[PDB]
Paper text:
Na+/H+ exchangers facilitate the exchange of monovalent cations (Na+/Li+/K+) and protons (H+) across membranes to regulate intracellular pH, sodium levels and cell volume. Na+/H+ exchangers that perform this task are physiological homodimers, and whilst the ion transporting domain is highly conserved, their dimerization differs. The transporter is made up of two distinct domains, a dimerization domain and an ion-transporting (core) domain. Here, we report cryo-EM structures of E. coli NhaA and E. caballus NHE9 in complex with cardiolipin and phosphatidylinositol-3,5-bisphosphate PI(3,5)P2 lipids binding at their respective dimer interfaces.
To improve the resolution of the NHE9* structure we substituted L139 and I444 residues to cysteines in an attempt to disulphide-trap the inward-facing state. We subsequently collected a larger data-set of 13,780 movies and the final 3D-reconstruction had 78,370 particles from which an EM map was reconstructed to 3.2 Å according to the gold-standard Fourier shell correlation (FSC) 0.143 criterion. Map density and sulphur atom distances, however, did not support disulphide bond formation between the two introduced cysteine residues. Given that NHE9* co-purified from yeast with several lipids corresponding to the molecular mass of PIP224, we attempted to model two PIP2 lipids into the NHE9* CC maps and found that the density was a better fit for the phosphatidylinositol-3,5-bisphosphate PI(3,5)P2, lipid, rather than the more abundant phosphatidylinositol-4,5-bisphosphate PI(4,5)P2 lipid. The glycerol backbone and acyl chains of the PI(3,5)P2 lipid form hydrophobic stacking interactions to W321 (TM8, TM8’). Two glutamine residue Q17 (TM1, TM1’) and N136 (TM3, TM3’) are well positioned to hydrogen-bond with the C3-phosphate group. The position of these polar residues could partially explain the preference for PI(3,5)P2 lipids, since there are no polar residues close enough to interact with a phosphate group at the C4-OH position. Following a rigid-body fit of the TM2-TM3 β-hairpin loop domain in the NHE9*CC maps, the positively-charged loop domain residues K105, K105’ K107, K107’ were aligned to help neutralize the negatively-charge headgroups of PI(3,5)P2. In the improved NHE9*CC structure, we could model part of the C-terminal tail without protein complex partners. However, in the absence of a regulatory protein, the C-terminal interfacial helix in NHE9*CC is making a number of direct contacts with the linker helix TM7 through interaction with a lysine residue, likely restricting its mobility and that of the core transport domains.
Residue numbers in the entry:
A (entry chain A), B (entry chain B): 17 to 496, 518 to 546
């Protein structure tokens, strides 16, 4: 063996060093850096010292076999060698024979990760922890505004970024950096939808540490949680778009079917999550499992995982279903578990989320491991840099004014600048970029997104505190009907009238 | 996709049903069955209803390719298809072309697991939980007796089982069930070493529930923890045995080198575990990480995993190293962590152990998934049945009398019958049997071990309570120097003199 052990030990060493440096920084109260940034810089340093360590080496070239009567490449095959059947699995396709001698040199360790690892084992824990960790205080007086933000602003920013990137591509055509025709408006819309998920983890951590006003914290948290799933489903729907004839056409009667597919996927995921949540709530309520914390904790975890797996197997998106199942569980089941099971579940899920996010950011810090990188054409980077800023500018202020028109007697003025500053890009955009490879435009967007994350995360983590002090934002604040469109009051009355007495309020806690 | 999702959902459903039935049984206090037995019977039922559901189907035969100039089958290869390099990984070798049409029928879902999964991800959590969960009360007055038991009795039982199985094979040669010459004394010794690890999880659970005398509980726990690692290393050393000439020779000057390899492996694993434990203890003591439970918990978990990975990568055995690291950590570091981190680590590790053992037993309950089963030749099964009983008989009473000669003023008489009754076989024997396949003798021992586990676990789980009542064993007992060879007193004085003031006793807890 001794292949996975080395990389796992390297990851453990990097994580331990990151934790030690974070403790050292927090002991002196230097701040100006989060554990995510430390993991990123440690990954970058590790990659830099690994690439330029044993570069002079031998050149390894794979064997070439002329397999006649084979016009297709199946994933699975059975090869007859020495009259014996051997199961051969197609792993990946390599079309870089020209650069193969360069790939042989400085090979070291590939240390690559499967692109679905960020989807089936890494993201769902973080998403479920975010959904479960709901304050249940506030977040209802501003639920409507959060909804309009996370829904309309995502599409607005996607459209703006797509249009600006299409304009920059058209300008490049005049500049003639490369061939014209490869790029399309569909790719620009894909990039715009991808560059719309915001995960200001460092900003939220600073807000929690400094005890900022809970309204801004709740707004930012709700937006950052919802827009991730919104952008994921929107990106999937955009990738679904494929006209039968005249590729990259405009209004080919598939807009309606794409919208229908998006709505159906969202509704199905929400329904599955809610159904599983009420199923486990009823199971906990009817039974008397409060005397065995291990059994109920295992049932809770297994039911959550089964909800995720059933959402994935049905053809829908498991991330949004996990989010909705988690929020519904925290709403209903949390009032039925024993006093010990609540602590067990909360601590376990928060530890899993911490470990997953640290591993994600540490792997994201590795930028030298991708051999087919396309970090060039600085005009593209400048265009993306301007596009993200202008999209964030047009996202907040118009919608903020529209909400302030019919404001719920609580005008949120001077807080829009904080939302402007908080524009970090999390793991969702990186995973969506790494999902698709072996394509020059796709590699271009992946490299630009990596550079944008590398810049913006560090710069805003450094500048959060001075920006907070300059805006005179209140700090140190202790946490301890008709205005809400009259619909949320009716929903609350319906919840407290029928669902509460049956799903909870009875049974030994 | 939709391949792993189905099997994962099936596993989740089976586990949920097992937990529900366990709660139903415990509500009425019927007992007579543990969660492990429930998982086993549910797996057996699932396999039975899956095998005989859609048996009539089509016959699938793999393609045959005449790859000339290929006298070897590498694990990795690069195939040139359509002038493109495809990475093909050799997964498994199939030499069952004669039964291939039968394999095509009733294929359903393979649901198989990689044999190393029981080794690198499943066992280490259980082993670390067992090592960490040390009472620290008693277990020292009887440490010497536990050592002599787990060391001498394992080898004695292995030798007895090997000799008896060799005699039964020789009798079969006269009976002529199959060809003579395939079996060897090395295989008999391998089987004897494999059938020596005892994991009486149900007996220990019943003892904990009924509050039995702590002396017998501590003795059984220590024996069951130590003999597993002892048998693992002994089996590896036996598999190492390979004479240069005259295969299956007797006393080929390799006995000394095998003993040296065994001793070196044990010493290296113990040294690695202890070194990592003192490293993390010193790190916790010197720093002031008591104010951040998440950071210290992550450091603890990462250091334990790194200890396991470094033990595995060095060429030694990671299970015994994990065990020793866990016991040393529970001895030293547990007195330095904050009051919250202790609860976090304990609860997380016990939950991981519970989930891992439940999954292990549920997978063990699947006996119809292995197509190349050799459940026949009932004389072999009868021989193994007699051999395990006589080995357990000769394991306890002679060593018990020898210990009672120089007894530490505490004669353990009438408790030997309880140790005789507790003779369950856990996951270690099953994993060691499943490690090696594609061999008629190996399949024979695997099938016999599976049958032995299936019988003994259920029968002893059923009969534990009447056997306890018949022996008049005290129940309901509340837990709350020179005699110890004078060496353990010196060790305790040395620990309390030098190591304790430096490794602990200082720093904010
Ligand atoms: C919503 C609930 C909370 C979020 C989810 C929490 C669960 C969580 O994050 O960890 C999942 C892990 C591992 O489970 P997980 O890693 O997610 O399982 C992966 C899937 O089977 C995936 O298939 P698809 O997803 O269908 O494409 C496969 O390709 C991966 O193989 P690869 O890694 O070699 O690439 C598997 O690793 O499983 C446990 O830890 C408990 C069971 C361990 C013992 C049984 C093992 C079979
Ligand atoms: C002593 C300490 C306590 C006992 C050990 C506790 C740790 C524990 O049991 O789970 C281990 C899991 C998974 O880690 P784990 O499953 O053990 O990792 C396996 C090894 O890499 C194995 O290689 P070798 O062992 O060298 O042969 C490989 O073949 C398996 O691939 P396969 O599954 O497709 O067959 C991997 O799954 O990792 C975490 O849960 C935290 C990190 C997750 C995020 C990073 C993922 C890279």
């Amino acid at each position: 063996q001794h292949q996975g052990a080395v990389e796992l030990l390297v990851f453990n060493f990097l994580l331990i060093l990151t934790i030690l440096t974070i403790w050292l920084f927090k002991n002196h109260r230097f701040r100006f850096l989060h554990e995510t940034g430390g993991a990123m810089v440690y990954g970058l340093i590790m990659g830099l010292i690994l690439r330029y360590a044993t570069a002079p080496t031998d050149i390894e070239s794979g064997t070439v076999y002329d397999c006649g009567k084979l016009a297709f490449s199946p994933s699975t095959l059975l090869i007859n060698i020495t009259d014996q059947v051997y199961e051969y699995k197609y792993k990946r396709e390599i079309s870089q024979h020209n650069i193969n001698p360069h790939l042989g040199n400085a090979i070291l360790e590939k240390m690559t990760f499967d692109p679905e690892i960020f989807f089936n084992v890494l993201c769902p824990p973080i998403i479920f922890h975010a959904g479960y960790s709901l304050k249940k205080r506030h977040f209802f007086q501003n639920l409507g505004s959060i909804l309009t933000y996370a829904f309309l602003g995502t599409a607005i920013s996607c459209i703006v970024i797509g249009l600006i990137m299409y304009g920059f591509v058209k300008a490049m055509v005049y500049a003639g950096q490369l061939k014209n025709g490869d790029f399309h408006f569909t790719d620009c819309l894909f990039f715009g939808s991808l560059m719309s998920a915001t995960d200001p983890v460092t900003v939220l951590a600073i807000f929690h540490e400094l005890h900022v006003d809970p309204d801004l914290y709740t707004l930012l948290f709700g937006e950052s949680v919802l827009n991730d799933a919104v952008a994921i489903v929107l990106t999937y729907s955009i990738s679904i778009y494929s006209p039968k004839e005249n590729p990259n056409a405009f209004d080919a009667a598939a807009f309606f079917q794409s919208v229908g597919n998006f709505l159906g996927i969202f509704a199905g995921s929400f329904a599955m999550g809610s159904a599983y949540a009420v199923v486990t709530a009823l199971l906990t309520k009817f039974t008397k499992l409060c005397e065995f914390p291990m059994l109920e904790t295992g049932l809770f975890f297994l039911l959550s995982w089964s909800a995720f797996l059933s959402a994935e197997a049905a053809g829908l998106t498991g991330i949004v279903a996990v989010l909705f199942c988690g929020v519904t569980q925290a709403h209903y089941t949390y009032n039925n578990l024993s006093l010990d099971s609540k602590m067990r579940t909360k601590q376990l899920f928060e530890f899993m989320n911490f470990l997953a996010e640290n591993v994600i950011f540490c792997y994201m810090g590795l930028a030298l491991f991708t051999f087919q990188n396309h970090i060039f054409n600085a005009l593209f980077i400048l265009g993306a840099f301007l596009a993200i800023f202008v999209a964030r500018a047009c996202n907040i202020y118009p919608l903020s004014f529209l909400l302030n028109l019919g404001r719920k007697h609580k005008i949120p003025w001077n807080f829009q600048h904080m939302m402007m500053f908080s524009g970090l890009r999390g793991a969702c955009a990186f995973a969506l970029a790494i999902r698709d490879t072996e394509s020059q435009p796709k590699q271009m967007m992946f490299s630009t997104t990596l550079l944008l994350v590398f810049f913006t995360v560090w710069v805003f983590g450094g500048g959060t505190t001075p920006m907070l002090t300059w805006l005179q934002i209140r700090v140190g604040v202790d946490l301890d009907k008709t205005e809400s469109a009259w619909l949320f009051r009716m929903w609350y009355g319906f919840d407290h009238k029928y669902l509460k007495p049956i799903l909870t309020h009875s049974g030994p806690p």
